[PDB]
Amino acid sequence: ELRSIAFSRAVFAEFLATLLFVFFGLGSALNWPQALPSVLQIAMAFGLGIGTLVQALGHISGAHINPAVTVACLVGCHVSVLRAAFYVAAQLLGAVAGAALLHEITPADIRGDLAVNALSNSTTAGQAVTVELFLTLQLVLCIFASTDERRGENPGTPALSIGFSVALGHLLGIHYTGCSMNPARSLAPAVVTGKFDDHWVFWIGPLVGAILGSLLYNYVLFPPAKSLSERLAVLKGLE
Amino acid sequence: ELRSIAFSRAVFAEFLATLLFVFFGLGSALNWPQALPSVLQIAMAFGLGIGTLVQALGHISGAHINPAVTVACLVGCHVSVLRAAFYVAAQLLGAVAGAALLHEITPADIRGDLAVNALSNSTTAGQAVTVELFLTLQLVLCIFASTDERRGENPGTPALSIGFSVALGHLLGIHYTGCSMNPARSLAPAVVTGKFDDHWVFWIGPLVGAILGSLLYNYVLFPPAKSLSERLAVLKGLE
Amino acid sequence: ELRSIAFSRAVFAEFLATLLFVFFGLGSALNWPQALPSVLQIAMAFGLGIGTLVQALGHISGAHINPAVTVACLVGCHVSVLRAAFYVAAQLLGAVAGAALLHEITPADIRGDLAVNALSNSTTAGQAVTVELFLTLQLVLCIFASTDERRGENPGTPALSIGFSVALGHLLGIHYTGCSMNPARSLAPAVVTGKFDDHWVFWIGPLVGAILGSLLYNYVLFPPAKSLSERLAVLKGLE
Amino acid sequence: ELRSIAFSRAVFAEFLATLLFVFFGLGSALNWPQALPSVLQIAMAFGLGIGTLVQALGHISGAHINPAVTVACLVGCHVSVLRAAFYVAAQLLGAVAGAALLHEITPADIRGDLAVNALSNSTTAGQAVTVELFLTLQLVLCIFASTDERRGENPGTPALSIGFSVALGHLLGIHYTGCSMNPARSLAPAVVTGKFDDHWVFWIGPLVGAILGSLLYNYVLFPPAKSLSERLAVLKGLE
């Protein structure tokens, strides 16, 4: 699987997707003095950023653009362990490269904290991790339903629904933590700016919520017909 | 039908859908001091919240996420009486659990009334119930058309159109009552906060509008070919 | 054709569509003192109002919801003269009934002019009619493309694209005339409020733009294969 | 190919698409004193303007509405050199005609600079061209994926995804350069108003980003099965 050319294109697609998502998402969330972005305006930038990249790079790599979604796909036996390892590595490397490019093009008077995720509105860490658990739970449920092969009778809008699911969470999670929903999106400006205050919330939150969202869909809500041998073959790099 | 495993998954899906809809909808409608949500911003949160859950949980339970829509489907002979009973029970229980989770994670200085539906802009109860009758009439008409099996030639966007229909009503109903459109969404913060002022509007309004919307579609606009025996078989738990 | 039951359902659908479009569109465009609607907020209400009704009532009557679109379909030989006569009559009657219902439910301190179309931003009548010509030209081009039977290979999003085309024009036409784009939507609050200042712009503008948009699509851009006898048969009530 | 009637309809469609895109996009981006458009409001006008015209004129000319996308399609061997020459000529002529019509209908007190692209927020030319390189890279990647014939199993939403990709870039690029993303959209008000300050950014930026976006999709991400003779036949006007 690693030696495949299509796999290398998938890792680069995940690298490029997280690079563009962090570039277009964090840049629109900056504190622009002339026109301060609204919560809906930031929500649509993060929202349509995923929806654009799912349309653009969904047929190449699946367009996870998120370690949490990659972990959720790993728990749901949708991707291999080696593919999930390379996708997370590509997502984390692409995010930092996306935030470093944004930090290099934005004026110094405007970057500030580069839109790091921080506990806002006097929200404690206990409440913050609970929001991120539910913010990514609806994203993973919407992603698994949109990318479900059992629903081929109604293709629907896989790109927009997944994209609008990110916008839905940002209309809520901005008021608490800036709506992380993505460990790569949180680590991208934290590495550049050195602001790692309460950074465990944006990692434990989205990952646990994605695991619970994946276990709900694949084992409780809509269980597939895959056997134990079939699930182990997908995980351990067998075609 | 009750003994079926797929039915139990449908009741849990309706429980989880109303839990997430109240969580993501009421939370974005709170009076955040730093960034007060606009009418469009609240509309898209309630709007894309339904659209996300219809994509996520439409193939499992139908994604009613509303007693009014469940009643409308019951009048239109789309669901059984026992399924409608369990869906409303799951919707009301999920909504209160969704509002209690939101009340426990939001700062005390920010919860306030937890975005209860109230008569705003000096609107009387008589005018308020008339808006909710039309707010849910367009939702039920859009839901029945999006989920119509006779329109298989053009699947369209069942998730987005239903979701955007909720956003359409919220661009109007926020100025009158906060745009209930859902007895579960109205009862969710009313139970927690104890604010039950003019609560009959948010129950009589959406239910009558959903009944009229269901009778318009199934008996006036687009009548199906189901006989009297077929309609009674669907209602009284017969497969 | 008149004696057909499906035709009577189409006239009532056009009556109900324009009733709901005027109800949900004009109400969200009112001058609410606590939360004055933005240009985008009014655009999405008029925008998603058409998109909801096209999804809801497109398979019943075509969901013109506009005399201009009905005239455009009449020029393009898509509907009969008798169907276009009854659709415009249903649209004009539904619009006034929709605006009268909105005027009866809105507080007196809030109705004001009930969001009548008026020349705003010191725009003269000459410039105003030129905008409405282009506002409805893009709507008719998007409607004819979305409802084209030759494009069955790609159904796309007929409901959302038509709906978002109305939102596109409202992001421009609000600053000039309140973005009429619909003689029924303009006549609805003008009749109730008695404000008929420069009302010819909102009739000559959208009608000429729809005729030019229909002649562009059906005779210049994408001409069909219909003969002269086929076009006359569709117009003069022949099946 | 030039003698074909369908080709002449494609050039007029590209002329009309860029005329309407500049008309509806620049007009909504003007400095209206009563209601100054937000960054999201301008983003949706430019965003839904492309999405409407892709739905309306995608089946006639491909709905490039952009020299950069036309160049990207030329590099990707999707259109001929003669078709790309005529599309750019139609796009540039339509844009100036679209901006001249908007300048003639807008009040003198409101036109101002007619929403020319300018370096805003103290952004230098070096940083500005880097944003436009990435703004058009995501547009070209989304356009090529939406119009890919290999993805016929999932048609998706070609009109909305391409349209929302333009809205995604405008949520970011407005704060830097007004989000050109289109040499025709930049040259349209620059010619009328005579404001050509740093105009090379809005030409070098989108063109290089479209070339890189086209080379990424067609040679790195999702290479097709076209041979060297097949690519040369498409480019040099051979059917």
Cα dihedral: A23, A26, A31, A36 (round 10):
90
Interface test with D, best of C42, C44, C133, C172 (most D CBs within 10 A): C172
Q: Position D222: which residue type?
A: F
DSSP per-residue letters across D86-145? HHHHHHHHHHHHHHHHHHHHS-HHHHTT-S-----TT--HHHHHHHHHHHHHHHHHHHHH
Contacts of A143 (CB under 8 A, 6+ apart): A69, A72, A162, A165
Of A47, A138, A220, the CB nearest to B56: A138
Cβ distance C35 to B40 less than 8 Å, yes or no, reads no
Cα–Cα distance for residue pair D39/D175, rounded to 1 Å: 8
Give D-chain residues touching C122 at CB under 8 angstroms.
107, 109-110
Ramachandran angles phi, psi of A227, nearest 5°: -85, 180
User: Which DSSP category does D146 fall into?
Assistant: H
Angle ∠(B154,A166,A131) on CA atoms, nearest 5: 135
CATH number of the domain that residue A30 is part of: 1.20.1080.10
Q: Is residue B140 within 8 Å of B68, Cβ to Cβ?
A: yes
Q: Position B222: which residue type?
A: F
Give D-chain residues touching A110 at CB under 8 angstroms.
121-122, 175
In total, the C-beta contacts within 8 angstroms joining chain A to chain B are 132
Q: Is residue B24 within 8 Å of A169, Cβ to Cβ?
A: yes
Kindly calculate the radius of gyration of chain D based on its CA atoms and give it in whole angstroms.
17
Q: Position A42: which residue type?
A: I
Any A CB within 8 A of B151 CB: no
Inter-CA distances, C85 with A165, B156, D169, Å? 43, 29, 44
Long-range contacts of B227-232 (CB under 8 A, 24+ apart): B230/B77, B231/B77
Cα–Cα distance for residue pair C26/D52, rounded to 1 Å: 23
Smallest Cα distance from D198 to chain A, Å: 16
Length of chain B: 239
Contacts of B42 (CB under 8 A, 6+ apart): B28, B29, B170, B174
Smallest Cα distance from B124 to chain A, Å: 30
Contacts of D131 (CB under 8 A, 6+ apart): A105, D123, D172, D173, D176, D177, D205
Any D CB within 8 A of C129 CB: no
Q: Where are the alpha helices (DSSP H) in A108-153?
A: 108-111, 125-146
Q: Is residue D69 within 8 Å of D21, Cβ to Cβ?
A: no
B17, two tokens:
């859908």
Torsion over CA: D203, D208, D209, D210 (sign): positive
Contacts of C198 (CB under 8 A, 6+ apart): C118, C119, C125, C128
Q: Could you tell me the residue range of the domain that residue A60 belongs to? A: 5-236
Cα–Cα distance for residue pair D188/D207, rounded to 1 Å: 16
The technique is cryo-EM
Phi-psi region of C237 (alpha: psi -120 to 50; beta: other; left: phi over 0): left
Contacts of A5 (CB under 8 A, 6+ apart): none
A147, two tokens:
């990318």
Cα–Cα distance for residue pair A94/D103, rounded to 1 Å: 43
Terminus-to-terminus CA distance in chain D, angstroms?
8
Any C CB within 8 A of B26 CB: no
Give C-chain residues touching B164 at CB under 8 angstroms.
48, 51-52, 160, 163
A7, two tokens:
């796999």
- Residue listed under structure tokens 């972990």: A71
Tell me the HSE value of D98 on the side-chain side, using a 13 A CA sphere.
28
Give A 95-124 residues with CB within 8 A of chain D. 101, 104-107, 109-110
Query: Which candidate, B200, B21, B19, B10, places its Cα nearest to that of B118?
Result: B200
Smallest Cα distance from C100 to chain B, Å: 13
The nearest alpha carbon in chain C to D40 belongs to C40
Any D CB within 8 A of A187 CB: no
Smallest Cα distance from A94 to chain D, Å: 14
Give C-chain residues touching B181 at CB under 8 angstroms.
none
- Residue listed under structure tokens 């014939």: D149
Cα–Cα distance for residue pair D65/D51, rounded to 1 Å: 11
Inter-CA distances, A135 with A68, A131, A169, B185, B191, Å? 11, 6, 5, 19, 24
Give A-chain residues touching B105 at CB under 8 angstroms.
123, 127, 130-131, 176
Contacts of D205 (CB under 8 A, 6+ apart): D128, D129, D130, D131, D132, D133, D135, D136, D177, D180
Q: Where are the alpha helices (DSSP H) in chain A?
A: 5-28, 39-61, 67-75, 81-105, 108-111, 125-146, 158-177, 183-193, 201-216, 228-235
Inter-CA distances, C40 with A164, C26, C167, Å? 18, 14, 8
What was the resolution (in A) of this experimentally determined structure?
Answer: 2.9
Cβ distance A172 to B45 less than 8 Å, yes or no, reads yes
Of A12, A24, A157, the CB nearest to D172: A24
The nearest alpha carbon in chain B to C164 belongs to B164
The nearest alpha carbon in chain B to C7 belongs to B221
The nearest alpha carbon in chain B to A135 belongs to B24
Q: E strands, B155-205, where?
A: none
Of B122, B160, B169, the CB nearest to C109: B122
Helix (H), strand (E) at residue D225: none
Query: Looking at the 3D structure of chain B, how many domains does it have?
Result: 1
Give C 29-88 residues with CB within 8 A of chain D. 38-40, 43, 47
Contacts of D85 (CB under 8 A, 6+ apart): none
Helix (H), strand (E) at residue B182: none
Long-range contacts of C192-199 (CB under 8 A, 24+ apart): C192/C96, C192/C99, C192/C100, C192/C103, C192/C114, C193/C103, C193/C113, C193/C114, C193/C116, C195/C113, C195/C116, C195/C118, C197/C118, C197/C119, C198/C118, C198/C119, C198/C125, C198/C128, C199/C117
Give C-chain residues touching B218 at CB under 8 angstroms.
none
Inter-CA distances, B218 with A9, A57, B92, B228, Å? 50, 41, 26, 13
| Strand, helix or coil for residue B37 | coil
Any B CB within 8 A of C213 CB: no
Q: 10 Å Cβ neighbour count for A220?
A: 15
